[PDB]
């Protein structure tokens, strides 16, 4: 529940484009603490540090046996995604519409 994850992160599938208006990134976690919280932290092209909305149930990684699903209300324009601590950190460039 508490401190965020320390391991690496890895997307296992499609980053669907739900027509309601969201990206639904599915990931699997290879790391130290297995019942952590997921370090999701979307940002803009510069890093004034935030740009995007988190739509999932406020999720956590409780397995390595189970791929953590994620939903996020991105902005209809160029933008960077992010998942995981500094080393081996997912840095998706969802900068599309």
């Amino acid at each position, epitope marked *: 529940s508490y401190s965020m994850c320390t391991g*690496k992160f*890895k*997307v*296992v*599938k499609e*980053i669907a484009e739900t027509q309601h208006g969201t990206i639904v990134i*599915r990931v*699997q976690y*290879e790391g130290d603490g297995s019942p952590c919280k997921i370090p999701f932290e979307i940002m803009d092209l510069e890093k004034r540090h935030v740009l995007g909305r988190l739509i999932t149930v406020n999720p956590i990684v409780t397995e390595k*046996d*189970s*791929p953590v699903n994620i939903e996020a209300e991105p902005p209809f324009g160029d933008s*960077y*995604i992010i998942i995981g601590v500094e080393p*081996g950190q997912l*840095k*998706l*460039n*969802w*900068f599309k519409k």
Partner: antibody
Amino acid sequence: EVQLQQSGAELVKPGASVKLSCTASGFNIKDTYMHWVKQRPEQGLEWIGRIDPANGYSKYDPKFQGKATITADTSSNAAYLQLSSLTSEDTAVYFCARDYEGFAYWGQGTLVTVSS
Amino acid sequence: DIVLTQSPASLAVSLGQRATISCRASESVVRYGNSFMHWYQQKPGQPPKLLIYRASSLESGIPTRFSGSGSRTDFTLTINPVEADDVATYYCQQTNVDPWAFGGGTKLEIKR
């Protein structure tokens, strides 16, 4: 823990079909993509196709679109592989893997020989 | 189509220095801003083993010098402490545009 178990190792007469299969250990099949890579004598691996237990959608490498047909079952935690109308050298160890980013857990290759 | 060029054809390394392998795709593999070039290490009679997933990240639990180096469509695998463990053909595979196929491979030979 985790890992895939393909079935047997059969010998099939030319002009017949085989029904390979991969199975789960500690993860649901809908979890991620699952494939079928083919490998002969020394001609290193050849990705055949991926399938999605979730959607149920599978895309192949054109030049394989006529032989194979990947499948899955959630009842059973397995993804199969129908390879038909085979030829004399349509012979290889047909493997099955897991990920999207680099394949992590592969199964005990299943060798298939087409013979008379 | 999409095409890979793993180039050392077959090399014989020492038992203590930098094993250098390379793979050169034709079209680009930079997907989510991240290039999708992965490596494998298949030994005799066994299935392939994933070294590097995205061009430079090192796997679940694989010995340290094994690392990626690469661009939108041009890469290379490395192993410095080449040891009596690393005897295999190494692979190179793409996962961006559907022909998610692998190269030809390279048969590392370690001297003793």
